[PDB]
Amino acid sequence: KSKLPKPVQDLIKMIFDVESMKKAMVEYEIDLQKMPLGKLSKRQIQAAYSILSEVQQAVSQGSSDSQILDLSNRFYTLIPHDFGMKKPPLLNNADSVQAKAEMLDNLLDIEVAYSLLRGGSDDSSKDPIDVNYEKLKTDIKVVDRDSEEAEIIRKYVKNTHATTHNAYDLEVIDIFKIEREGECQRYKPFKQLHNRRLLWHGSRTTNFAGILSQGLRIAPPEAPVTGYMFGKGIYFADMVSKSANYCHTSQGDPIGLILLGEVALGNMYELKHASHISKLPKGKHSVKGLGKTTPDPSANISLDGVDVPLGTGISSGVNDTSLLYNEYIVYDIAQVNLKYLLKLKFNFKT
Numbered sequence: 136k137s138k139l140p141k142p143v144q145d146l147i148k149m150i151f152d153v154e155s156m157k158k159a160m161v162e163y164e165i166d167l168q169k170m171p172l173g174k175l176s177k178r179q180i181q182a183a184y185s186i187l188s189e190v191q192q193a194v195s196q197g198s199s200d201s202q203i204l205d206l207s208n209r210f211y212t213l214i215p216h217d218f219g220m221k222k223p224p225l226l227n228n229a230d231s232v233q234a235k236a237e238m239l240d241n242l243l244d245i246e247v248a249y250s251l252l253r254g255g256s257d258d259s260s261k262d263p264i265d266v267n268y269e270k271l272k273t274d275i276k277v278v279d280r281d282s283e284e285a286e287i288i289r290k291y292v293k294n295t296h297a298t299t300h301n302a303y304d305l306e307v308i309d310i311f312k313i314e315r316e317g318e319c320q321r322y323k324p325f326k327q328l329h330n331r332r333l334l335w336h337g338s339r340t341t342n343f344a345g346i347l348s349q350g351l352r353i354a355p356p357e358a359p360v361t362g363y364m365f366g367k368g369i370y371f372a373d374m375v376s377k378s379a380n381y382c383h384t385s386q387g388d389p390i391g392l393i394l395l396g397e398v399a400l401g402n403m404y405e406l407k408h409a410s411h412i413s414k415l416p417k418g419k420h421s422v423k424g425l426g427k428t429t430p431d432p433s434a435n436i437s438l439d440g441v442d443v444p445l446g447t448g449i450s451s452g453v454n455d456t457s458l459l460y461n462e463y464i465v466y467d468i469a470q471v472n473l474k475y476l477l478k479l480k481f482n483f484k485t
C-alpha cells in the first residue's frame with residue numbers, strides 16, 4: 136500500500152485511467168473494435184498525419200470535390216472510425232483537417248500512456264499507484280497551501296481569468312511541484328536567459344501521462360503545419376482561462392489539469408495574425424501572439440527569479456489583431472522547464 140500523499144495518488148489514478156483513454160477515443164468517433172486501444176501505434180498515427188497532409192495541399196490549392204474523395208477516404212482507412220454502413224464525412228475544408236490533426240495529437244499522447252501500462256513488469260505485492268508513479272520519471276511534491284508558492288499561484292489563477300471565458304470559474308484543488316528527470320539538464324543553455332516567464336499550458340487529462348514522461352513535445356514532421364496558427368511549437372498563455380479551455384472539461388467531467396512552466400522567451404518575434412512558420416528569423420528565440428488584452432505589466436512579480444505576469448487584464452493598445460489574449464510559442468523543447476501542476480475544479484454556470 137502506497138506511502139505517497141493522497142493528492143499524488145489521486146493524480147496518478149486519473150493520469151493512467153484506461154477508461155478515460157477509451158472515452159477520449161470514443162469522443163473522436165474512433166472505432167474501438169477495428170482500432171482498439173491496444174493496437175495504437177506511432178507508425179499508424181504518423182501515416183495518418185501524412186495522409187492528412189495530402190488533404191492539406193489539395194484543400195489549399197483548390198481540388199475538385201471528387202479529387203478530395205480519395206484522399207479523405209484514404210485517411211479513414213488508416214484511422215478507423217465508427218459510422219456503421221454509411222460513408223464517413225468528407226474532409227473537404229481546412230477546419231475538418233485540423234480537427235483530425237488535433238485527434239492525432241492526443242492519440243500520440245494516449246499511446247504513450249498505454250505503452251507505459253503494458254510495458255515493464257508487474258508485482259502483485261506492490262501498489263499499482265506506486266508502480267505507475269515510477270513510470271513518469273517525475274518527482275511530484277504537494278505544495279503547501281500555507282506556503283508562499285501557493286499564494287503567488289492562487290493569485291495567478293485569481294487575476295488572469297478572462298471575462299470572455301465567464302461561463303465558469305476556477306477553484307484550485309491541489310498544487311504540485313513537479314521535477315522531470317533530466318529536464319534541468321536540458322534547460323541549461325537557457326537557464327539565465329532574459330524574458331523568462333511562468334506561463335500556463337492546458338491539456339486534456341488523457342495527455343498528462345505523456346507530458347510528464349516525455350515532456351511538452353512538438354508535432355512530428357508528418358503533421359500539417361497549416362493546422363497550427365504560429366507553426367509547430369509549444370504554445371503557452373498568460374491568462375489562466377485561455378489555457379483552461381484546452382482541458383476540455385464539462386459538467387459531466389469538471390476536473391481538469393493545467394501546467395505552469397518556465398519558458399525562455401528571450402527576443403520575441405511578435406505577430407498579430409497567422410504565420411505557419413517553420414524556422415525563426417535570426418536572433419529570435421520565441422514567437423509572441425499579440426492579444427487585445429494583456430496582464431498589467433506593472434503588476435509583475437518574481438517567483439524564484441522567474442517573472443509571473445499575474446496582473447489584472449488591461450488593454451494592450453494593439454489594433455487589428457486576430458487574438459484577444461497573448462500566446463507564446465517556442466520551437467525548441469529545451470526552452471521549457473515544467474515547474475507546477477494544478478488540479479482545477481471547473482464550476483460551470485452554464
Ligand SMILES: O=C(c1cc(Cc2n[nH]c(=O)c3ccccc23)ccc1F)N1CCn2nc(C(F)(F)F)nc2C1
Pocket residue numbers: 240241243244335336337338351352353354355363364366367368369370371372377378379381461462463
Ligand atoms: O503545445 C501545443 C499546442 C497547443 C495548442 C492549443 C493550446 N493548448 N493549451 C494552451 O494552454 C494554449 C495556450 C495558448 C495557445 C494555445 C494553447 C495549439 C498549438 C500547439 F502547438 N502542442 C500541440 C499538440 N501537441 N502534440 C504534441 C505531440 F508531440 F504529442 F505530438 N505536442 C504538442 C504540443
